[PDB]
């Protein structure tokens, strides 16, 4: 419950990018840079903290436990305004530091920009729902920075960690209990060109140190450590950190490489091993050449040395000849193999053969070849094993299988090998570290061209992966001499860290029948060590050497998959009910990443069945696909020209007829023959069939341990295929049709207060967008309700259920063909829509293309592996798009979500899944040069793409529109679901950040993450739990996209928006009640709910016939308000039943453009509902609340006279004018003080302690003792609050009434004082207008709110007495 007070300051530190403690060159410092950073101070800024060395510009580290507060006492000592902005849920509008359009008063604008040489005070509060609190890591990490200028105030060196932790861990010194260290690492890129002192800089630093000049950080050996890896850069960078020789554990995944994208952070743990130096490598092929790393030296502290189990429990020893005698060679390589079916013209007759005498016959291509003999006298296989081809030398490592790597360099250059996540033994280095010790304890890394060598490491059962990880981990191994040059030469393999899966010393696996190796390498011959043996030596046209030319240079860029370019001419055939296991990885001198769409099936991923994998550069991943379909399919990547339409691997999934191995070309080894016949899978040894590795007779010691001991103790067609699926079908009628569409919705009267913003692009653009119609015969559409206001460009949400069956009658209506393609779903090739080779005549090709003005009816089947796993969640998002040309279609607008929810989620609202809010958002940047309707020579510049506005034709949209995206409205403290998707703009990884909010995952039931990184292809379902009302801001915190256009001001409102908007009270005067048609004589100024008299309903003139037309009454508000319901009522004089039954509602913010859609609205199908009898107050609710100035209702069907009385239910503007609790009872009577509890001597007592609005009983107001202009009513709010508005009233006693008429307001500070309320733009006090009638209310507003907890009300001029019932509308500030 403590308060983490913190003193910070910002000063201009002259900072070179390296440290040096000398003199001669340390006065004349040749290189330097101006910088502004964060430096912590002792209280009152007298002294200054030590500022440990390893943190160069990384500012002070803030921290807290769940429950405490933070009072950062900022003080800007630099010469430009600055601020501080953390990440999470805490900040109210005066402690967030960001200055955007949120409609706040000049009081809460001070935190946004602190002038140079001025103080402030930042206060936060770590709630119970912003911390981990469960199986999350012991405690998380967030980055705090400057929000005044997200680009000029970061590269100037303004950043710092914010390390919030879990209740019960953090000590007083700011260090965890069990952990022995608290390290923080800032991988960053400080572009000094976009900085305060704009000088060019090629800086790829870490903490402010370049090329690895950071001083060595060191710890002891065999202890537990805690990491905190930040990362931040203006541009969209990527940091694939790698810990050499060690293993980490983030997110319960025993990973050996942590990936961070810009403006993100994470925490992780590891236990250090024996001593010896190490390196923190950055795997990204760009952060390598640049040069950035650290050093991990390990000391030897004389405290304790552990002694644990060495042998594998004395039974699973497995000590035999299962070592590996690998080597290197330079054999001939055919990228397209010898005489394939699908020949290629480029690589054959221009790059291998002597046809037109290009090179010769030979490629000098190195590869790790595997000899099975020790003496290196024979390869293991010269031909192939019927299904491998180039399945690499498989290195399967498990507990003590005598894994010895014998190595015989037989090449013409120094080479080596280097695995991943494999600690070395000091007998042989197995790494190219600098300090290779002397001849005594030697550690050799390279091998000269002709030598031999011997490595040594056999893993034991001491680093088994977590159960949440995959079955068989996969890791590469390559030549560590020069990575980019050696891998290009062709040195790479797979190192498989499986589990205790050995049944025999041959090493077969279980739980995965068939396995296939697939890596995505890209051999850049221009960076190979045999280009000279390609053009220089072996050649016949070197006459004028082809080089430095776009043709020749890019022609030898051979991006392949397992080397072989053309095709696996044997498509990967399979059986049914099998569980194939795949191993994925990728290398190549290229920064970008890949995503591998898996057409047709899906694979388990942490018990979720995802269908797209984003594999990162130079680190692998393993999946498991199941055979539950029949037909041909694909495995494709889709990023851009060289890889999208190229990387494909066709593979069957079939059997015919029994199991397909009686007369066919897939004879496996069961062999599905007569059951009485012999083959593999039936190898009965002496004892019995496969049980284990045979050992002692019984060896009673057959207990499996826990790992580490628990120690410390007309084409109107329909669907046709739904015959055997036997489904609970659900029908939809989509279409596709052109439309005009311009992203900029703020100039569409959203936030266009300006009048001179010159449009820098085209006015609008012609897209093609999905729609939703009502039946098989079209032209009867379904308009987008209030729910679908934020969809923007996405089609209709196609919802479903587990084990359902979907029928979709797509019907193209555009100029070129289109189609559909689901994801993670089940269908047939005649229900796929993808364009490639099939297994039938153009009968299965009926869906592959939907010609214009026609229609096809797909049949999709959502099975068990297509539903939302991870019981912590409810619905599972997905996507569908026009997959005829998947790159130019999605960039045209044809994209939509496809949700799948569990069994039970659907209400009697057409049975479409409902019962929990959900916003769907597709973060994507739209390119107009990749669409179909891209008129090339636009009217700005025809030569280049608007050379006058270069690259102005790419729009960073947030789900359609830009800067506006209206429709995002949530309550306070309500669980809303979010389906964030990203498949359009691939190479741009996005990180989603809501202001003042903390997201959440499920499955493992707990994950906060602060902000989430959207991987291009992932489908993420999260939960929000909105925090506080006001105008917040949704964006992506990559500073060069937040300013580019990805920022939407979503809205949190109050959680009690149920207050009358003035109809019954009297706020809404009768000067603004209109009517088109009328009912007799009953003036509409008398349409007030619960109004008595003789005429109490709506009319102006006489009707004489009213049953068919739809008259209307129009209420005005004079300001934009919220409306969350309506309170209907019936009228009569003595004998008119006269009630309305059905009635719809319109609304408008301009009185001209009306949106009549809340009657037959979203939750409704095509109707609304109303009253049931005479005066019995009946009310309805607008589930998505509406917000408009004018509102107009129209009754259709009533009882013999369509009358009504209406009363509205809304809230306010800033969005926190909630009842402070007077009438609610949330305030007790001990927060009200005044002068006299005025009593008579022949009657009652006049209580200034019952000033409740609309509370009834005895004298329930404050008639002061004696009349004078010097009484008052003082309210002690018990904590400083923002007092927004006031409502006065009048009182009486059964007789002549009297009431206040005009009052002034004296208020206080935190303490006891009283000061007048001088009008902002005046020189004297402000005067208010009190009541005018007895019971009617009057609302008075404050131009700036009164931020206090003392407030006095001065009755200045009144009517014959002081008397009022009072209610303040305030806000719970902190």
Swiss-Prot record:
Binding site for Cu cation: 993, 995
Result, substituting residue 506 to Q: In THPH2; factor V Leiden; risk factor for Budd-Chiari syndrome; risk factor for ischemic stroke
Example GO BP: blood coagulation
Alphabetical list of SUPFAM superfamilies matching this protein: Cupredoxins (SSF49503), Galactose-binding domain-like (SSF49785)
Compartment annotation: Secreted
Site (Cleavage): 306-307, 506-507, 679-680, 709-710, 723-724
Domain F5/8 type A: 2-301, 320-656, 728-1057
Pfam families: Cu-oxidase_3, F5_F8_type_C
Phosphothreonine PTM positions: 612
PTM annotation: Thrombin activates factor V proteolytically to the active cofactor, factor Va (formation of a heavy chain at the N-terminus and a light chain at the C-terminus). Sulfation is required for efficient thrombin cleavage and activation and for full procoagulant activity.
Principal place of residence: secreted
Impact noted for substituting residue 1252 to C: In FA5D; impairs both factor V secretion and activity
Occurrences of domain Plastocyanin-like (ranges): 2-165, 175-301, 320-498, 508-656, 728-901, 911-1057
Effect noted on mutating residue 359 to T: In THPH2; Liverpool; mutant protein is expressed with an additional carbohydrate chain
Activity regulation statement: Inhibited by SERPINA5.
Disulphide linkage map: 139-165, 220-301, 472-498, 575-656, 875-901, 1057-1211, 1216-1371
Disorder cited: Factor V deficiency: A blood coagulation disorder leading to a hemorrhagic diathesis known as parahemophilia.
Family that this chain belongs to: Belongs to the multicopper oxidase family.
Record remark on domains: Domain B contains 35 x 9 AA tandem repeats, and 2 x 17 AA repeats.
Function according to Swiss-Prot or TrEMBL: Central regulator of hemostasis. It serves as a critical cofactor for the prothrombinase activity of factor Xa that results in the activation of prothrombin to thrombin.
Name assigned to this protein: Coagulation factor V
Organism: Homo sapiens (Human)
């Amino acid at each position: 419950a403590q308060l983490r007070q913190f003193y910070v300051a910002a000063q201009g530190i002259s900072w070179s990018y390296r440290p040096e403690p000398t003199n001669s060159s340390l006065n004349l410092s040749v290189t330097s840079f101006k910088k502004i950073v964060y430096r912590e101070y002792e209280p009152y800024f007298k002294k200054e903290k030590p500022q440990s060395t390893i943190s160069g510009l990384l500012g002070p580290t803030l921290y807290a436990e769940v429950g405490d507060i933070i009072k950062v006492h900022f003080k800007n000592k630099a010469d430009k305004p600055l601020s501080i902005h953390p990440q999470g849920i805490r900040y109210s509008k005066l402690s967030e530091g960001a200055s955007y359009l949120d409609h706040t008063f000049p009081a809460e604008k001070m935190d946004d920009a602190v002038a140079p040489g001025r103080e402030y005070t930042y206060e936060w509060s770590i709630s119970e729902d912003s911390g981990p609190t469960h199986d999350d890591p012991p405690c998380l990490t967030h980055i705090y920075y400057s929000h005044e200028n997200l680009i000029e105030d970061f590269n100037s060196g303004l950043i710092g960690p914010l390390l919030i932790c879990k209740k019960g861990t953090l000590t007083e010194g700011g260090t965890q209990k069990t952990f022995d260290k608290q390290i923080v690492l800032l991988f960053a890129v400080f572009d000094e060109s976009k900085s305060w002192s704009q000088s060019s800089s090629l800086m790829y630093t870490v903490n402010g140190y370049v090329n690895g000049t950071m001083p060595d950080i060191t710890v002891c050996a065999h202890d537990h450590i805690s990491w905190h890896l930040l990362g931040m850069s203006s541009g969209p960078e990527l940091f694939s950190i790698h810990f050499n020789g060690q293993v980490l554990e983030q997110n319960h995944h025993k990973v050996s490489a942590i990936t961070l994208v810009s403006a993100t952070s994470t925490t992780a743990n590891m236990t250090v091993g024996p001593e010896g130096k190490w390196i923190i490598s950055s795997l990204t092929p760009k952060h390598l050449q640049a040069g950035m790393q650290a050093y991990i030296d390990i000391k030897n502290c004389p405290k304790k040395t552990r002694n644990l189990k060495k042998i594998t429990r004395e039974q699973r020893r497995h000590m035999k000849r299962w070592e590996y005698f690998i080597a290197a060679e330079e054999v001939i390589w055919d990228y397209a193999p010898v005489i394939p079916a699908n020949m290629d013209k480029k690589y054959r007759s221009q790059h291998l053969d002597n046809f037109s005498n290009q090179i010769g016959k030979h490629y000098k291509k190195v590869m790790y070849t595997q000899y099975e003999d020790e003496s290196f006298t024979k390869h293991t296989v010269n031909p192939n094993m019927k299904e491998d081809g180039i399945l690499g030398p498989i290195i399967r490592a498990q507990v003590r299988d005598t894994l010895k790597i014998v190595f015989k360099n037989m090449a013409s250059r120094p080479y080596s090998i280097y695995p991943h996540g494999v600690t070395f033994s000091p007998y042989e280095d197995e790494v190219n570290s600098s300090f290779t010790s002397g001849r005594n304890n030697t550690m050799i890394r390279a091998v000269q061209p002709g030598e031999t060598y011997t490595y040594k490491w056999n893993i034991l059962e001491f680093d088994e992966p977590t159960e949440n990880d995959a079955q068989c981990l996969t890791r590469p191994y390559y030549s560590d001499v020069d990575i980019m040059r050696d891998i290009a030469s062709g040195l790479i393999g797979l190192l498989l860290i499986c589990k205790s899966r050995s049944l025999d010393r041959r090493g077969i696996q279980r739980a995965a029948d068939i396995e296939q190796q697939a890596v995505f390498a890209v051999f850049d011959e221009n960076k190979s060590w045999y280009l000279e043996d390609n053009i220089n030596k072996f050649c016949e046209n070197p006459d004028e050497v082809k080089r430095d030319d776009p043709k020749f240079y890019e022609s030898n860029i051979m991006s392949t998959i397992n080397g072989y370019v053309p095709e696996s001419i044997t498509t990967l055939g399979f059986c049914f009910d099998d569980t194939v296991q795949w191993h994925f990885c990728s290398v190549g001198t290229q920064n970008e990443i890949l995503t591998i769409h898996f057409t047709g099936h899906s694979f388990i991923y942490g018990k979720r069945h995802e269908d797209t994998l984003t594999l990162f550069p130079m680190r692998g991943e393993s999946v498991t696909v199941t055979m539950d379909n029949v037909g041909t399919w694909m495995l494709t990547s889709m990023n851009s020209s060289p890889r999208s339409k190229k990387l494909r691997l066709k593979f069957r999934d079939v059997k015919c007829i029994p199991d397909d191995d009686e007369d066919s070309y897939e004879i496996f080894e069961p062999p599905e023959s007569t059951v009485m016949a012999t083959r593999k899978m039936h190898d009965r040894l002496e004892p019995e069939d496969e049980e284990s590795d045979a050992d002692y007779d019984y060896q009673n010691r057959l207990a499996a341990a826990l790992g580490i001991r628990s120690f410390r103790n007309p084409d109107n067609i329909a669907a046709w295929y739904l015959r055997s699926n036997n489904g609970n079908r659900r029908n939809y009628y989509i279409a596709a049709e052109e439309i005009s569409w311009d992203y900029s919705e703020f100039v569409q009267r959203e936030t266009d207060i300006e009048d001179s913003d010159d449009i820098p692009e085209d006015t609008t653009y012609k897209k093609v967008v999905f729609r939703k119609y009502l039946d098989s015969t079209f032209t009867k559409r379904d308009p987008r309700g209030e729910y679908e206001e934020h969809l923007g460009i996405l089609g209709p949400i196609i919802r479903a259920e587990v084990d359902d069956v979907i029928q979709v009658r797509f019907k193209n209506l555009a100029s070129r063909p289109y189609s559909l393609h689901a994801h993670g779903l089940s269908y047939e090739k005649s229900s796929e829509g993808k364009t490639y080779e099939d297994d039938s005549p153009e009968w299965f090709k009926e869906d592959n293309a939907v010609q214009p003005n026609s229609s096809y009816t797909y049949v999709w089947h959502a099975t068990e592996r297509s539903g939302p796993e991870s019981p912590g969640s409810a619905c599972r998002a997905w996507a569908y798009y026009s997959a005829v040309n998947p790159e130019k279609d999605i960039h045209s607008g044809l994209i939509g979500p496809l949700l799948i929810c569990q069994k039970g989620i659907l209400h009697k609202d057409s049975n479409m899944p409902m019962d929990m809010r959900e916003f769907v958002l597709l973060f994507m940047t739209f390119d107009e040069k990749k669409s179909w309707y891209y008129e090339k020579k636009s009217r700005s510049s025809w030569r280049l793409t608007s050379s006058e506005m270069k690259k102005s034709h790419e729009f960073h949209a947030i789900n359609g529109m830009i800067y506006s995206l209206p429709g995002l409205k949530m309550y306070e403290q309500e669980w809303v679901r979010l389906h964030l998707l990203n498949i359009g703009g691939s190479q741009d990884i996005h990180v989603v950040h809501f202001h003042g909010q903390t997201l959440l995952e499920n499955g493992n039931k707990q994950h906060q993450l602060g902000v989430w990184p959207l991987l291009p292809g992932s489908f993420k379902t999260l939960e929000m739990k909105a925090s506080k009302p006001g105008w917040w801001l949704l964006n992506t915190e990559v500073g060069e996209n937040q300013r580019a256009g990805m920022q939407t001001p979503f809205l949190i409102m109050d959680r009690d928006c149920r207050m009358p908007m003035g109809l019954s009270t009297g706020i809404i005067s009768d000067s603004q009640i209109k009517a088109s048609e009328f009912l007799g004589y009953w003036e509409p100024r008398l349409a007030r709910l619960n109004n008595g008299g003789s005429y109490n309903a709506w009319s102006v003139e006489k009707l004489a016939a009213e049953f068919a037309s739809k008259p209307w009454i129009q209420v005005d508000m004079q300001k934009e308000v919220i409306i969350t319901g309506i309170q209907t009522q019936g009228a009569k004089h003595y004998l008119k039943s006269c009630y309305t039954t059905e009635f719809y509602v319109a609304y408008s913010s301009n009185q001209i453009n009306w949106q009549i859609f809340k009657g037959n609205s979203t939750r409704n199908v095509m109707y609304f509902n109303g009253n049931s009898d005479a005066s019995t107050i009946k009310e309805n609710q607008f589930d998505p609340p509406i917000v408009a100035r004018y509102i107009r209702i129209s009754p259709t069907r009533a009882y013999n006279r369509p009358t009504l009385r209406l009363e509205l239910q809304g809230c306010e503007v800033n969005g926190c004018s909630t009842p402070l609790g007077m009438e609610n009872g949330k305030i007790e009577n001990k927060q009200i003080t005044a002068s006299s509890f005025k009593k008579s001597w022949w009657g009652d007592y006049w209580e200034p302690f019952r000033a409740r609005l609309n509370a009834q009983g005895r004298v329930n107001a404050w008639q002061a003792k004696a009349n004078n202009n010097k009484q008052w009513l003082e309210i002690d709010l018990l904590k400083i609050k923002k007092i927004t508005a006031i409502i006065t009233q009048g009182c009486k006693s059964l007789s002549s009434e009297m009431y206040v008429k005009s009052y002034t307001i004296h208020y206080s500070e935190q303490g006891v004082e009283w000061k007048p309320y001088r009008l902002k733009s005046s020189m004297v006090d402000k005067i208010f207008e009190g009541n005018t009638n007895t019971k009617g209310h009057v609302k008075n507003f404050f131009n700036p709110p009164i931020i206090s907890r003392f407030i006095r009300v001065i009755p200045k001029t009144w009517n014959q007495s002081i008397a009022l019932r009072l209610e303040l509308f305030g806000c719970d500030i902190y």
